[PDB]
Protein: Death associated transcription factor 1
Organism: Mus musculus
Amino acid sequence: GSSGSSGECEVYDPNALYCICRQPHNNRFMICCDRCEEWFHGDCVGISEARGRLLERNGEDYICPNCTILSGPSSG
Ligand SMILES: [Zn+2]
Ligand SMILES: [Zn+2]
């Protein structure tokens, strides 16, 4: 049977999971990874509010842990 529900969008929706902790975007600090290109919470991924803030202004490429944890740096 025809299935599809494309209506209003919000964070409240519990079905919306981003961070690895399976939690909605809350006040918690969030950053945009480059490896997995996913949304996570600083505290969760360790990255502190400040640690990330700089990565922006400075111009550094943040790399969540869950990513590196898998494999080391480039070049195997
Ligand atoms: Zn989280
Ligand atoms: Zn990542």
User: Anything to note?
Assistant: The beta strands are 30-32, 39-41.
